[PDB]
């Protein structure tokens, strides 16, 4: 039984709050992949891959983003395989945020 529950938020800014959270989803990989993720199944899959390790989620290689500087803060909170997680990362703009997971940030 996987204790697995995450909450992802995104807002414009460079720190947790000085960055109002404009969007927020929840992801559950255990038992089955569910939640509020226009891409539950996949994110879980992405995590499965790297094994819950934010920081080991390769960008694109295949995608270009506009070179606008409009930073986005992403926060991840919860547990993966019953190990607590609290990740936070600022991306240059949102396109950069989306070229990161495959699906996790497929939001």
């Amino acid at each position: 039984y996987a204790p697995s529950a995450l909450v992802l938020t995104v807002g414009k800014g460079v720190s947790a709050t000085t960055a109002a959270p404009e969007r927020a989803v929840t992801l559950t990989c255990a038992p089955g992949p569910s939640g509020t993720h226009p891409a539950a199944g996949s994110a879980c899959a992405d995590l499965a891959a790297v094994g819950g390790d934010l920081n080991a989620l390769t960008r694109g290689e295949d995608v270009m983003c506009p070179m606008v500087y409009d930073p986005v803060l992403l926060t991840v909170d919860g547990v993966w395989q019953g190990k607590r997680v609290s990740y936070e990362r600022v991306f240059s703009n949102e396109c950069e945020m989306n070229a990161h997971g495959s699906s996790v940030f497929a939001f």
Partner: protein, 275 residues
């Protein structure tokens, strides 16, 4: 009333405009998210889309490409803003989708359209941290064909003492452009590395937005079109200088700023370039 963005002044475009050099008859392809051809302060000549699911190059659902386009060529009239090369012929080569994302092969196809339609200048305010052989081949081909290729350096700030310049900006055949503010200070976000060539205004740059709007953006994206517009003025003064000659001019007449890992050769000065 028409206002002149500070950045157009900083590079000394208005000196050339008064001598009658406005970019007339120069073909500039803005490889980007499209250009809203319905904006009152823009005049778009043609273009095409490489985005399979968004086939109209003159509908900019992201707004980025419209802003970039206005820094190159917002019209010289009594409304809005004023571009670097207000008489240039502007082509919308759409390769980024509504969300700003574009596949490498879209980009490449955009570049190939640009070469085959005899563009004089290409602007690519886009980037990615990985390079590719086809991407390289495409940019190199453009430069072999006589096109001035300009790109923004990237927005990954500094990182130890490693280069943070992305592709296509990283390729030697490309003019890679960093961002300065009105005080000639490198913006914090501007990429650094031995591959950076020149600097241009990239901080709160006023320009056209879709829906008859105007607004200010930040990024090496906003810097790039200043150099592309600068290449168009030079071509308009000297129509049979080669791309090698335009580039050289731009690079040798810069206003030296800090160390070249952060500032490349420095701030372009189009009046000095045009001789």
């Amino acid at each position: 009333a028409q206002s002149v963005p500070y950045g157009v002044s900083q590079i000394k475009a208005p000196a050339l405009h008064s001598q009658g050099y406005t970019g007339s008859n120069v073909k500039v392809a803005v490889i980007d998210s499209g250009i809203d051809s319905s904006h009152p302060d823009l005049k778009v000549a043609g273009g095409a889309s490489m985005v399979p699911s968004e086939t109209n190059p003159f509908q900019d659902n992201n707004s980025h490409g419209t802003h970039v386009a206005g820094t190159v060529a917002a019209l010289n009239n009594s409304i809005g803003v004023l571009g670097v090369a207000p008489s240039a012929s502007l082509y919308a080569v759409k390769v980024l989708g509504a969300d700003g994302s574009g596949q490498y092969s879209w980009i490449i196809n955009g570049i190939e359209w640009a070469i085959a339609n005899n563009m004089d200048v290409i602007n690519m305010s886009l980037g990615g941290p990985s390079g590719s052989a086809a991407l390289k081949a495409a940019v190199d081909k453009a430069v072999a064909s006589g096109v001035v290729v300009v790109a923004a350096a990237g927005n990954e700030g500094t990182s130890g003492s490693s280069s943070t310049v992305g592709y296509p900006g990283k390729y030697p055949s490309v003019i890679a452009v960093g961002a300065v503010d009105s005080s000639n200070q490198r913006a914090s976000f501007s990429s650094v590395g031995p591959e950076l060539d020149v600097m241009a205004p990239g901080v709160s740059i006023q320009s056209t937005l879709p829906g008859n709007k105007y607004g200010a953006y930040n990024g090496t994206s906003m810097a790039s079109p200043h150099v592309a517009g600068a290449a168009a003025l030079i071509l308009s003064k000297h129509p049979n200088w080669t791309n090698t000659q335009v580039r050289s001019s731009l690079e040798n007449t810069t206003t030296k700023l800090g160390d070249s890992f952060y500032y490349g050769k420095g701030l372009i000065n189009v009046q000095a370039a045009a001789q």
